Ligand SMILES: Nc1nc2c(ncn2[C@@H]2O[C@H](COP(=O)(O)OP(=O)(O)O)[C@@H](O)[C@H]2O)c(=O)[nH]1
């Protein structure tokens with residue numbers, strides 16, 4: 561502990577070598593700075609996992625650089641990556657997009673990019689692979705344009721992005737000329753990836769779960785400080801639902817123990833000055849003053865479960881009106897489907913425009929669930945906010 565910890569993963573097109581790279585990384589690193597070398601298969605045969613209520617196939621691996629310690633995840637199929645990205649089951653302070661030099665960019669390449677940004681993947685590094693299969697100076701540089709430029713197409717610094725050329729293969733077999741790229745690749749994670757923003761540091765915030773009124777000199781709302789800190793005296797905004805209202809944090813108690821400040825991650829009951837129980841309700845949230853606005857219309861990438869996992873058994877259509885759980889509650893919304901799209905089948909993902917009846921404190925990257933009679937039928941992340 562203190563050894564900086566970073567969470568990464570290999571994204572990219574199928575067979576482009578995400579997994580093959582993953583391997584090479586631990587190995588190359590084990591041999592060099594000591595550690596544990598992992599076998600392709602132990603990685604290709606991915607166990608499942610259950611997050612937010614779904615089933616993904618994910619392999620978790622570890623390896624260390626000097627200064628840092630990395631947490632790494634590599635998926636089997638695009639979907640796993642899809643689900644994982646949208647849910648966030650596995651976090652990614654950066655991503656190792658994997659591109660083969662024999663195919664150039666591919667649909668999925670795009671997709672994963674598309675998602676990463678949409679989902680708050682802050683940083684992404686690139687390993688041009690299978691370079692062993694290509695000896696064409698000129699060809700390579702074309703790819704970098706194809707890329708640095710596709711990259712910029714989705715709001716990432718294409719012209720400022722690292723691109724490690726290599727052969728995840730040769731390096732896995734033991735061809736030293738090639739290992740250094742894993743090394744070159746590694747170094748980048750260390751220098752290029754800024755240690756993340758911590759939760760406690762991030763802006764203060766708290767989803768209101770319950771609301772009471774004791775004594776009779778101020779009210780008490782409960783819920784988990786999702787982020788930032790809250791110091792008694794720092795005012796707050798109660799955003800969501802009805803017009804926003806202001807107040808001041810008068811008391812912090814966690815199990816009858818009187819305290820002076822709430823930290824991201826703790827469950828607390830905050831005492832507010834001059835606000836009534838009828839002026840506050842679940843769904844709303846305690847947030848540093850001005851750190852978030854409420855909306856009703858938003859663009860989001862969404863996934864509908866299957867029958868096997870427990871989701872709807874049929875498709876749904878426009879004018880569909882399910883519910884959307886946000887941290888603490890459900891809100892009915894109207895669905896708009898991309899041009900072309902006419903019905904969503906269970907097991908599909910679609911960028912879909914939802915329209916809620918009430919306002920909800922929100923910002924891009926938020927994840928929600930979709931439900932029916934309180935049953936979960938899908939999940940999403942607010943890609944972009946509109947209204
Ligand atoms: N020639 C060559 N083949 C490679 C290299 N890296 C991976 N491959 C091959 O590419 C295929 C797919 O690689 P893989 O890592 O499984 O891609 P994935 O489907 O994204 O996981 C495998 O059969 C590997 O042997 C490389 O550096 N050179």
Ligand SMILES: [Mg+2]
Pocket residue numbers: 575578579580604635636637
């Ligand atoms: Mg694979």
